[PDB]
DNA sequence: CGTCCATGTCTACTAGACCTGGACGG
């Protein structure tokens, strides 16, 4: 679900589809309320890139494919349970909501956006969501600037643990990353955001917003039962024995150690 | 059987709503 997983999903799409050629239409499950993808091509390649908590697929017709198609872009958010899988055409997982079909010569495969709870969404248009800040993984300096330029924003009145989830400034950070980040600096989660970002204008909190998710990207994995164990072995705080936890203002669990901090409930 | 919990938004009147499924309680 978080920035590293989106990033790994987009590497997965790029690598797994490196030698695939897709054809035909793009199929959506009936249950899915996201929009139909009007795209048909006899021969196209798929590629991807990630930005924070979004992923962009590009569908690219080979030369001379028919019908006529200019490339198409789609932007995915995963919600709580999204992923991409490459599977045998007739062995679709349950909840594969959007499906791209390889073309012949070779084994009939399907690239699927798989999403159990259907919190994920896509849009037509390759446009990043307006409002999202820069990617903490891939656009670090922009990300860092955008936070420091904007400390007056009322978002920074909130505890630091809540501010870290705001995708306008922390695009890519989610519930496990906020615990892991805060925990490396032993910053109380209910310290006030502005105070912690008002005295830093030895990695600092904004640097870890980049390097911590980068560590995850570097474990590789997220199924892209063995890889989940490397991840579990990497977590130091989120869900771990001996840690405290509390409910933030929006009912989400913050894991931490020690001082809850002045704005605690 | 039931309750609770989960890597996020999204929406409409901060408190649900939107979903499925696994762990675990009786």
PDB file of C-alpha atoms (C1' of nucleotides) in Angstrom:
ATOM      1  CA  UNK A   1       0.000   0.000   0.000  1.00  0.00           C
ATOM      2  CA  UNK A   2       2.737   2.606   0.677  1.00  0.00           C
ATOM      3  CA  UNK A   3       5.243   4.387  -1.488  1.00  0.00           C
ATOM      4  CA  UNK A   4       7.689   1.535  -1.553  1.00  0.00           C
ATOM      5  CA  UNK A   5       5.022  -0.963  -2.585  1.00  0.00           C
ATOM      6  CA  UNK A   6       3.783   1.258  -5.423  1.00  0.00           C
ATOM      7  CA  UNK A   7       7.352   1.644  -6.548  1.00  0.00           C
ATOM      8  CA  UNK A   8       7.965  -2.110  -6.459  1.00  0.00           C
ATOM      9  CA  UNK A   9       4.697  -2.722  -8.285  1.00  0.00           C
ATOM     10  CA  UNK A  10       5.860  -0.396 -11.054  1.00  0.00           C
ATOM     11  CA  UNK A  11       9.248  -2.151 -11.299  1.00  0.00           C
ATOM     12  CA  UNK A  12       7.414  -5.379 -11.406  1.00  0.00           C
ATOM     13  CA  UNK A  13       5.252  -4.259 -14.300  1.00  0.00           C
ATOM     14  CA  UNK A  14       8.289  -3.000 -16.142  1.00  0.00           C
ATOM     15  CA  UNK A  15      10.267  -6.164 -15.700  1.00  0.00           C
ATOM     16  CA  UNK A  16       7.589  -8.730 -16.095  1.00  0.00           C
ATOM     17  CA  UNK A  17       6.240  -7.011 -19.209  1.00  0.00           C
ATOM     18  CA  UNK A  18       9.592  -6.335 -20.724  1.00  0.00           C
ATOM     19  CA  UNK A  19       9.150  -8.989 -23.365  1.00  0.00           C
ATOM     20  CA  UNK A  20       5.403  -9.265 -23.466  1.00  0.00           C
ATOM     21  CA  UNK A  21       3.205  -7.998 -26.153  1.00  0.00           C
ATOM     22  CA  UNK A  22      -0.386  -7.365 -25.261  1.00  0.00           C
ATOM     23  CA  UNK A  23      -3.383  -7.312 -27.560  1.00  0.00           C
ATOM     24  CA  UNK A  24      -7.099  -6.730 -27.623  1.00  0.00           C
ATOM     25  CA  UNK A  25      -9.147  -4.770 -25.189  1.00  0.00           C
ATOM     26  CA  UNK A  26      -8.640  -3.880 -21.564  1.00  0.00           C
ATOM     27  CA  UNK A  27     -11.120  -5.777 -19.389  1.00  0.00           C
ATOM     28  CA  UNK A  28     -12.809  -4.655 -16.207  1.00  0.00           C
ATOM     29  CA  UNK A  29     -14.786  -6.765 -13.725  1.00  0.00           C
ATOM     30  CA  UNK A  30     -18.531  -5.865 -13.440  1.00  0.00           C
ATOM     31  CA  UNK A  31     -18.269  -5.415  -9.754  1.00  0.00           C
ATOM     32  CA  UNK A  32     -15.653  -2.593 -10.185  1.00  0.00           C
ATOM     33  CA  UNK A  33     -16.939   0.978 -10.026  1.00  0.00           C
ATOM     34  CA  UNK A  34     -13.834   2.460 -11.635  1.00  0.00           C
ATOM     35  CA  UNK A  35     -14.222   3.508 -15.197  1.00  0.00           C
ATOM     36  CA  UNK A  36     -13.992   1.308 -18.299  1.00  0.00           C
ATOM     37  CA  UNK A  37     -10.780   1.806 -20.174  1.00  0.00           C
ATOM     38  CA  UNK A  38     -11.498   2.596 -23.806  1.00  0.00           C
ATOM     39  CA  UNK A  39      -8.424   1.131 -25.401  1.00  0.00           C
ATOM     40  CA  UNK A  40      -8.007  -1.488 -28.030  1.00  0.00           C
ATOM     41  CA  UNK A  41      -4.877  -2.470 -29.902  1.00  0.00           C
ATOM     42  CA  UNK A  42      -3.643  -5.571 -31.662  1.00  0.00           C
ATOM     43  CA  UNK A  43      -0.114  -5.177 -30.340  1.00  0.00           C
ATOM     44  CA  UNK A  44       0.922  -2.992 -27.366  1.00  0.00           C
ATOM     45  CA  UNK A  45       3.550  -2.882 -24.613  1.00  0.00           C
ATOM     46  CA  UNK A  46       2.934  -1.895 -21.017  1.00  0.00           C
ATOM     47  CA  UNK A  47       5.315   0.089 -18.780  1.00  0.00           C
ATOM     48  CA  UNK A  48       4.997   1.969 -15.538  1.00  0.00           C
ATOM     49  CA  UNK A  49       6.314   4.467 -13.170  1.00  0.00           C
ATOM     50  CA  UNK A  50       5.433   5.338  -9.556  1.00  0.00           C
ATOM     51  CA  UNK A  51       5.087   8.664  -7.818  1.00  0.00           C
ATOM     52  CA  UNK A  52       4.442   8.561  -4.111  1.00  0.00           C
ATOM     53  CA  UNK A  53       1.330   6.575  -3.510  1.00  0.00           C
ATOM     54  CA  UNK A  54       0.352   6.435  -7.199  1.00  0.00           C
ATOM     55  CA  UNK A  55       1.357   4.346 -10.148  1.00  0.00           C
ATOM     56  CA  UNK A  56       1.052   5.249 -13.799  1.00  0.00           C
ATOM     57  CA  UNK A  57       0.701   2.582 -16.523  1.00  0.00           C
ATOM     58  CA  UNK A  58       1.479   3.454 -20.087  1.00  0.00           C
ATOM     59  CA  UNK A  59      -0.148   1.397 -22.865  1.00  0.00           C
ATOM     60  CA  UNK A  60       1.900   1.693 -26.014  1.00  0.00           C
ATOM     61  CA  UNK A  61       0.782   0.315 -29.389  1.00  0.00           C
ATOM     62  CA  UNK A  62       3.604  -1.072 -31.475  1.00  0.00           C
ATOM     63  CA  UNK A  63       4.094   0.475 -34.952  1.00  0.00           C
ATOM     64  CA  UNK A  64       1.266  -0.431 -37.309  1.00  0.00           C
ATOM     65  CA  UNK A  65      -0.989  -1.879 -34.656  1.00  0.00           C
ATOM     66  CA  UNK A  66      -4.644  -1.593 -35.404  1.00  0.00           C
ATOM     67  CA  UNK A  67      -6.910  -0.098 -34.788  1.00  0.00           C
ATOM     68  CA  UNK A  68      -5.338   3.308 -34.407  1.00  0.00           C
ATOM     69  CA  UNK A  69      -4.306   4.266 -30.972  1.00  0.00           C
ATOM     70  CA  UNK A  70      -2.183   6.930 -29.539  1.00  0.00           C
ATOM     71  CA  UNK A  71      -0.608   5.713 -26.356  1.00  0.00           C
ATOM     72  CA  UNK A  72      -2.790   5.717 -23.266  1.00  0.00           C
ATOM     73  CA  UNK A  73      -1.955   6.461 -19.654  1.00  0.00           C
ATOM     74  CA  UNK A  74      -3.728   5.328 -16.538  1.00  0.00           C
ATOM     75  CA  UNK A  75      -3.115   6.233 -12.924  1.00  0.00           C
ATOM     76  CA  UNK A  76      -3.753   3.814 -10.136  1.00  0.00           C
ATOM     77  CA  UNK A  77      -4.125   4.199  -6.386  1.00  0.00           C
ATOM     78  CA  UNK A  78      -4.007   0.907  -4.468  1.00  0.00           C
ATOM     79  CA  UNK A  79      -6.050   1.738  -1.362  1.00  0.00           C
ATOM     80  CA  UNK A  80      -5.590  -0.917   1.348  1.00  0.00           C
ATOM     81  CA  UNK A  81      -5.260  -3.999  -0.830  1.00  0.00           C
ATOM     82  CA  UNK A  82      -4.278  -3.259  -4.408  1.00  0.00           C
ATOM     83  CA  UNK A  83      -1.558  -5.033  -6.394  1.00  0.00           C
ATOM     84  CA  UNK A  84      -0.550  -6.139  -9.848  1.00  0.00           C
ATOM     85  CA  UNK A  85      -0.056  -9.740 -10.851  1.00  0.00           C
ATOM     86  CA  UNK A  86       0.946 -11.432 -13.983  1.00  0.00           C
ATOM     87  CA  UNK A  87      -1.108 -14.657 -14.263  1.00  0.00           C
ATOM     88  CA  UNK A  88      -2.103 -17.409 -16.783  1.00  0.00           C
ATOM     89  CA  UNK A  89      -5.108 -16.021 -18.726  1.00  0.00           C
ATOM     90  CA  UNK A  90      -7.545 -18.640 -17.363  1.00  0.00           C
ATOM     91  CA  UNK A  91      -6.232 -18.626 -13.810  1.00  0.00           C
ATOM     92  CA  UNK A  92      -7.352 -15.132 -12.834  1.00  0.00           C
ATOM     93  CA  UNK A  93      -7.210 -14.442  -9.173  1.00  0.00           C
ATOM     94  CA  UNK A  94     -10.340 -13.554  -7.285  1.00  0.00           C
ATOM     95  CA  UNK A  95     -10.840  -9.730  -7.378  1.00  0.00           C
ATOM     96  CA  UNK A  96      -8.785  -9.066 -10.487  1.00  0.00           C
ATOM     97  CA  UNK A  97     -10.524  -5.901 -11.450  1.00  0.00           C
ATOM     98  CA  UNK A  98      -8.707  -4.822 -14.529  1.00  0.00           C
ATOM     99  CA  UNK A  99      -7.006  -7.161 -16.896  1.00  0.00           C
ATOM    100  CA  UNK A 100      -4.578  -6.785 -19.802  1.00  0.00           C
ATOM    101  CA  UNK A 101      -4.118  -9.807 -22.080  1.00  0.00           C
ATOM    102  CA  UNK A 102      -1.000 -10.926 -23.790  1.00  0.00           C
ATOM    103  CA  UNK A 103      -1.193 -11.493 -27.470  1.00  0.00           C
ATOM    104  CA  UNK A 104      -0.043 -14.655 -29.226  1.00  0.00           C
ATOM    105  CA  UNK A 105       2.910 -16.138 -29.685  1.00  0.00           C
ATOM    106  CA  UNK A 106       3.542 -17.793 -26.317  1.00  0.00           C
ATOM    107  CA  UNK A 107       1.545 -18.498 -23.210  1.00  0.00           C
ATOM    108  CA  UNK A 108      -1.676 -16.505 -22.769  1.00  0.00           C
ATOM    109  CA  UNK A 109      -1.100 -14.305 -19.674  1.00  0.00           C
ATOM    110  CA  UNK A 110      -3.030 -11.606 -17.940  1.00  0.00           C
ATOM    111  CA  UNK A 111      -1.630  -8.569 -16.144  1.00  0.00           C
ATOM    112  CA  UNK A 112      -4.231  -7.816 -13.466  1.00  0.00           C
ATOM    113  CA  UNK A 113      -4.820  -5.011 -11.090  1.00  0.00           C
ATOM    114  CA  UNK A 114      -5.964  -7.080  -8.151  1.00  0.00           C
ATOM    115  CA  UNK A 115      -7.778  -5.397  -5.329  1.00  0.00           C
ATOM    116  CA  UNK A 116      -9.594  -7.371  -2.590  1.00  0.00           C
ATOM    117  CA  UNK A 117     -11.357  -4.491  -0.728  1.00  0.00           C
ATOM    118  CA  UNK A 118     -11.771  -2.234  -3.813  1.00  0.00           C
ATOM    119  CA  UNK A 119     -10.430   0.849  -2.059  1.00  0.00           C
ATOM    120  CA  UNK A 120      -8.127   1.313  -5.038  1.00  0.00           C
ATOM    121  CA  UNK A 121      -9.103   3.508  -7.957  1.00  0.00           C
ATOM    122  CA  UNK A 122      -7.953   4.387 -11.399  1.00  0.00           C
ATOM    123  CA  UNK A 123      -8.373   7.298 -13.729  1.00  0.00           C
ATOM    124  CA  UNK A 124      -8.220   7.863 -17.392  1.00  0.00           C
ATOM    125  CA  UNK A 125      -5.542  10.388 -18.089  1.00  0.00           C
ATOM    126  CA  UNK A 126      -2.035   9.858 -17.050  1.00  0.00           C
ATOM    127  CA  UNK A 127      -2.327  12.790 -14.678  1.00  0.00           C
ATOM    128  CA  UNK A 128      -0.948  12.618 -11.042  1.00  0.00           C
ATOM    129  CA  UNK A 129      -3.608  13.575  -8.567  1.00  0.00           C
ATOM    130  CA  UNK A 130      -3.705  17.262  -8.312  1.00  0.00           C
ATOM    131  CA  UNK A 131      -2.867  18.211  -4.792  1.00  0.00           C
ATOM    132  CA  UNK A 132      -0.407  15.421  -4.116  1.00  0.00           C
ATOM    133  CA  UNK A 133       3.064  16.574  -3.043  1.00  0.00           C
ATOM    134  CA  UNK A 134       6.223  15.230  -4.741  1.00  0.00           C
ATOM    135  CA  UNK A 135       7.367  11.674  -4.345  1.00  0.00           C
ATOM    136  CA  UNK A 136       9.395  11.178  -1.125  1.00  0.00           C
ATOM    137  CA  UNK A 137      11.339   8.474  -2.969  1.00  0.00           C
ATOM    138  CA  UNK A 138      11.900   9.914  -6.359  1.00  0.00           C
ATOM    139  CA  UNK A 139      11.601  13.680  -5.898  1.00  0.00           C
ATOM    140  CA  UNK A 140      13.298  14.177  -2.566  1.00  0.00           C
ATOM    141  CA  UNK A 141      14.485  17.769  -2.909  1.00  0.00           C
ATOM    142  CA  UNK A 142      11.146  18.910  -4.240  1.00  0.00           C
ATOM    143  CA  UNK A 143       9.441  17.016  -1.494  1.00  0.00           C
ATOM    144  CA  UNK A 144      11.732  18.590   1.129  1.00  0.00           C
ATOM    145  CA  UNK A 145      11.192  22.103  -0.293  1.00  0.00           C
ATOM    146  CA  UNK A 146       7.466  21.743  -0.508  1.00  0.00           C
ATOM    147  CA  UNK A 147       7.328  20.931   3.142  1.00  0.00           C
ATOM    148  CA  UNK A 148       9.699  23.699   4.309  1.00  0.00           C
ATOM    149  CA  UNK A 149       7.997  26.405   2.059  1.00  0.00           C
ATOM    150  CA  UNK A 150       4.664  25.577   3.681  1.00  0.00           C
ATOM    151  CA  UNK A 151       4.970  25.268   7.433  1.00  0.00           C
ATOM    152  CA  UNK A 152       2.250  27.891   7.917  1.00  0.00           C
ATOM    153  CA  UNK A 153      -0.289  25.501   6.500  1.00  0.00           C
ATOM    154  CA  UNK A 154      -2.812  24.471   9.077  1.00  0.00           C
ATOM    155  CA  UNK A 155      -1.821  20.855   8.327  1.00  0.00           C
ATOM    156  CA  UNK A 156       1.190  21.595  10.411  1.00  0.00           C
ATOM    157  CA  UNK A 157      -0.813  22.371  13.442  1.00  0.00           C
ATOM    158  CA  UNK A 158      -1.520  18.664  13.775  1.00  0.00           C
ATOM    159  CA  UNK A 159       0.573  16.066  15.576  1.00  0.00           C
ATOM    160  CA  UNK A 160       3.505  14.969  13.535  1.00  0.00           C
ATOM    161  CA  UNK A 161       2.113  11.478  13.282  1.00  0.00           C
ATOM    162  CA  UNK A 162      -1.020  12.861  11.547  1.00  0.00           C
ATOM    163  CA  UNK A 163       0.845  15.290   9.312  1.00  0.00           C
ATOM    164  CA  UNK A 164       3.002  12.425   8.038  1.00  0.00           C
ATOM    165  CA  UNK A 165      -0.064  10.871   6.404  1.00  0.00           C
ATOM    166  CA  UNK A 166      -1.110  13.974   4.583  1.00  0.00           C
ATOM    167  CA  UNK A 167      -0.428  13.206   0.919  1.00  0.00           C
ATOM    168  CA  UNK A 168      -0.292  16.893  -0.011  1.00  0.00           C
ATOM    169  CA  UNK A 169       3.147  16.992   1.766  1.00  0.00           C
ATOM    170  CA  UNK A 170       4.101  13.356   2.429  1.00  0.00           C
ATOM    171  CA  UNK A 171       3.135  11.626  -0.841  1.00  0.00           C
ATOM    172  CA  UNK A 172       4.118   8.044  -0.257  1.00  0.00           C
ATOM    173  CA  UNK A 173       4.124   7.861   3.509  1.00  0.00           C
ATOM    174  CA  UNK A 174       1.554   5.583   5.165  1.00  0.00           C
ATOM    175  CA  UNK A 175       0.787   4.020   8.430  1.00  0.00           C
ATOM    176  CA  UNK A 176       3.777   1.708   8.713  1.00  0.00           C
ATOM    177  CA  UNK A 177       6.249   4.215   7.402  1.00  0.00           C
ATOM    178  CA  UNK A 178       5.096   6.916   9.833  1.00  0.00           C
ATOM    179  CA  UNK A 179       5.823   4.534  12.729  1.00  0.00           C
ATOM    180  CA  UNK A 180       9.178   3.456  11.385  1.00  0.00           C
ATOM    181  CA  UNK A 181      10.270   6.974  10.600  1.00  0.00           C
ATOM    182  CA  UNK A 182       9.308   8.483  13.997  1.00  0.00           C
ATOM    183  CA  UNK A 183      10.836   5.618  15.724  1.00  0.00           C
ATOM    184  CA  UNK A 184      14.296   6.006  14.155  1.00  0.00           C
ATOM    185  CA  UNK A 185      14.401   9.557  15.613  1.00  0.00           C
ATOM    186  CA  UNK A 186      12.461   8.753  18.750  1.00  0.00           C
ATOM    187  CA  UNK A 187      10.234  11.670  17.991  1.00  0.00           C
ATOM    188  CA  UNK A 188       7.015  11.462  20.000  1.00  0.00           C
ATOM    189  CA  UNK A 189       4.162  10.895  17.565  1.00  0.00           C
ATOM    190  CA  UNK A 190       2.050  13.575  19.158  1.00  0.00           C
ATOM    191  CA  UNK A 191       4.639  16.169  19.125  1.00  0.00           C
ATOM    192  CA  UNK A 192       3.322  19.102  17.070  1.00  0.00           C
ATOM    193  CA  UNK A 193       4.340  18.885  13.431  1.00  0.00           C
ATOM    194  CA  UNK A 194       5.421  22.504  13.051  1.00  0.00           C
ATOM    195  CA  UNK A 195       7.655  22.330  16.116  1.00  0.00           C
ATOM    196  CA  UNK A 196       9.496  19.339  14.765  1.00  0.00           C
ATOM    197  CA  UNK A 197       9.796  20.921  11.320  1.00  0.00           C
ATOM    198  CA  UNK A 198      10.352  24.435  12.663  1.00  0.00           C
ATOM    199  CA  UNK A 199      13.703  23.662  14.289  1.00  0.00           C
ATOM    200  CA  UNK A 200      15.383  21.897  11.368  1.00  0.00           C
ATOM    201  CA  UNK A 201      14.844  24.317   8.483  1.00  0.00           C
ATOM    202  CA  UNK A 202      22.164  12.543  12.217  1.00  0.00           C
ATOM    203  CA  UNK A 203      19.582  12.339   9.372  1.00  0.00           C
ATOM    204  CA  UNK A 204      16.622  14.680  10.050  1.00  0.00           C
ATOM    205  CA  UNK A 205      12.974  13.743   9.878  1.00  0.00           C
ATOM    206  CA  UNK A 206      12.608  14.886   6.303  1.00  0.00           C
ATOM    207  CA  UNK A 207      15.660  12.999   5.186  1.00  0.00           C
ATOM    208  CA  UNK A 208      14.276   9.803   6.741  1.00  0.00           C
ATOM    209  CA  UNK A 209      11.028  10.281   4.855  1.00  0.00           C
ATOM    210  CA  UNK A 210      13.136   9.470   1.872  1.00  0.00           C
ATOM    211  CA  UNK A 211      15.696   6.961   3.121  1.00  0.00           C
ATOM    212  CA  UNK A 212      13.450   4.850   5.223  1.00  0.00           C
ATOM    213  CA  UNK A 213      11.049   4.069   2.362  1.00  0.00           C
ATOM    214  CA  UNK A 214      14.067   3.643   0.220  1.00  0.00           C
ATOM    215  CA  UNK A 215      15.313   0.866   2.509  1.00  0.00           C
ATOM    216  CA  UNK A 216      12.136  -1.042   1.803  1.00  0.00           C
ATOM    217  CA  UNK A 217      12.476  -0.639  -1.923  1.00  0.00           C
ATOM    218  CA  UNK A 218      15.884  -2.086  -1.472  1.00  0.00           C
ATOM    219  CA  UNK A 219      14.799  -5.184   0.398  1.00  0.00           C
ATOM    220  CA  UNK A 220      13.008  -5.842  -2.929  1.00  0.00           C
ATOM    221  CA  UNK A 221       9.892  -7.973  -2.394  1.00  0.00           C
ATOM    222  CA  UNK A 222       6.235  -7.322  -1.350  1.00  0.00           C
ATOM    223  CA  UNK A 223       5.336 -10.387  -3.514  1.00  0.00           C
ATOM    224  CA  UNK A 224       6.880  -8.792  -6.637  1.00  0.00           C
ATOM    225  CA  UNK A 225       5.266 -15.763   2.029  1.00  0.00           C
ATOM    226  CA  UNK A 226       9.118 -15.576   2.047  1.00  0.00           C
ATOM    227  CA  UNK A 227       9.423 -11.871   1.097  1.00  0.00           C
ATOM    228  CA  UNK A 228       6.890 -10.864   3.708  1.00  0.00           C
ATOM    229  CA  UNK A 229       9.308 -12.274   6.285  1.00  0.00           C
ATOM    230  CA  UNK A 230      12.144 -10.098   5.134  1.00  0.00           C
ATOM    231  CA  UNK A 231       9.781  -7.157   5.499  1.00  0.00           C
ATOM    232  CA  UNK A 232       8.632  -8.306   8.902  1.00  0.00           C
ATOM    233  CA  UNK A 233      12.318  -8.656   9.915  1.00  0.00           C
ATOM    234  CA  UNK A 234      12.978  -5.072   8.757  1.00  0.00           C
ATOM    235  CA  UNK A 235      10.139  -3.443  10.721  1.00  0.00           C
ATOM    236  CA  UNK A 236      11.352  -2.155  14.099  1.00  0.00           C
ATOM    237  CA  UNK A 237       8.213  -0.526  15.381  1.00  0.00           C
ATOM    238  CA  UNK A 238       5.014  -0.899  13.462  1.00  0.00           C
ATOM    239  CA  UNK A 239       2.987  -3.637  15.196  1.00  0.00           C
ATOM    240  CA  UNK A 240       6.014  -4.910  17.188  1.00  0.00           C
ATOM    241  CA  UNK A 241       5.997  -6.521  20.649  1.00  0.00           C
ATOM    242  CA  UNK A 242       6.897  -3.945  23.356  1.00  0.00           C
ATOM    243  CA  UNK A 243       5.712  -0.905  21.383  1.00  0.00           C
ATOM    244  CA  UNK A 244       2.857   1.298  22.407  1.00  0.00           C
ATOM    245  CA  UNK A 245       0.125   2.255  20.083  1.00  0.00           C
ATOM    246  CA  UNK A 246      -2.618   4.808  20.139  1.00  0.00           C
ATOM    247  CA  UNK A 247      -5.490   5.898  17.862  1.00  0.00           C
ATOM    248  CA  UNK A 248      -4.880   9.138  16.080  1.00  0.00           C
ATOM    249  CA  UNK A 249      -7.611  11.638  15.339  1.00  0.00           C
ATOM    250  CA  UNK A 250      -8.762   9.706  12.292  1.00  0.00           C
ATOM    251  CA  UNK A 251      -8.930   6.396  14.143  1.00  0.00           C
ATOM    252  CA  UNK A 252      -5.683   5.078  12.631  1.00  0.00           C
ATOM    253  CA  UNK A 253      -3.176   3.258  14.833  1.00  0.00           C
ATOM    254  CA  UNK A 254       0.173   4.853  15.510  1.00  0.00           C
ATOM    255  CA  UNK A 255       2.871   2.511  16.809  1.00  0.00           C
ATOM    256  CA  UNK A 256       5.697   4.048  18.872  1.00  0.00           C
ATOM    257  CA  UNK A 257       7.968   3.736  21.832  1.00  0.00           C
ATOM    258  CA  UNK A 258       8.017   5.874  24.918  1.00  0.00           C
ATOM    259  CA  UNK A 259       6.666   9.356  25.237  1.00  0.00           C
ATOM    260  CA  UNK A 260       3.384   9.686  23.346  1.00  0.00           C
ATOM    261  CA  UNK A 261       4.013  13.399  23.162  1.00  0.00           C
ATOM    262  CA  UNK A 262       2.183  16.516  24.233  1.00  0.00           C
ATOM    263  CA  UNK A 263      -0.808  16.331  21.860  1.00  0.00           C
ATOM    264  CA  UNK A 264      -1.756  12.778  22.842  1.00  0.00           C
ATOM    265  CA  UNK A 265      -5.431  11.937  23.235  1.00  0.00           C
TER     266      UNK A 265
ATOM    267  C1'  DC B   1     -21.636 -18.094  15.003  1.00  0.00           C
ATOM    268  C1'  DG B   2     -19.690 -13.472  16.313  1.00  0.00           C
ATOM    269  C1'  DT B   3     -16.007  -9.080  17.013  1.00  0.00           C
ATOM    270  C1'  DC B   4     -11.910  -6.892  15.590  1.00  0.00           C
ATOM    271  C1'  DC B   5      -8.270  -5.593  12.733  1.00  0.00           C
ATOM    272  C1'  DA B   6      -5.774  -4.317   8.393  1.00  0.00           C
ATOM    273  C1'  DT B   7       0.301  -0.751   4.125  1.00  0.00           C
ATOM    274  C1'  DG B   8      -6.188   4.750   2.275  1.00  0.00           C
ATOM    275  C1'  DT B   9      -8.648   7.644   0.695  1.00  0.00           C
ATOM    276  C1'  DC B  10     -13.178   9.989  -0.225  1.00  0.00           C
ATOM    277  C1'  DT B  11     -17.202  12.249   1.027  1.00  0.00           C
ATOM    278  C1'  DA B  12     -20.972  14.383   2.984  1.00  0.00           C
ATOM    279  C1'  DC B  13     -23.254  16.370   7.177  1.00  0.00           C
ATOM    280  C1'  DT B  14     -15.265  15.041  12.056  1.00  0.00           C
ATOM    281  C1'  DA B  15     -17.550  10.832  11.567  1.00  0.00           C
ATOM    282  C1'  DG B  16     -18.772   7.607   8.569  1.00  0.00           C
ATOM    283  C1'  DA B  17     -18.505   4.951   4.120  1.00  0.00           C
ATOM    284  C1'  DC B  18     -16.419   2.011   1.138  1.00  0.00           C
ATOM    285  C1'  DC B  19     -14.928  -3.557   1.067  1.00  0.00           C
ATOM    286  C1'  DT B  20     -13.111  -8.426   1.989  1.00  0.00           C
ATOM    287  C1'  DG B  21     -11.084 -11.671   4.745  1.00  0.00           C
ATOM    288  C1'  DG B  22      -8.178 -13.531   8.463  1.00  0.00           C
ATOM    289  C1'  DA B  23      -7.291 -14.048  13.374  1.00  0.00           C
ATOM    290  C1'  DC B  24      -9.289 -15.198  17.034  1.00  0.00           C
ATOM    291  C1'  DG B  25     -13.267 -15.450  20.865  1.00  0.00           C
ATOM    292  C1'  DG B  26     -17.534 -18.242  22.636  1.00  0.00           C
TER     293       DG B  26
END
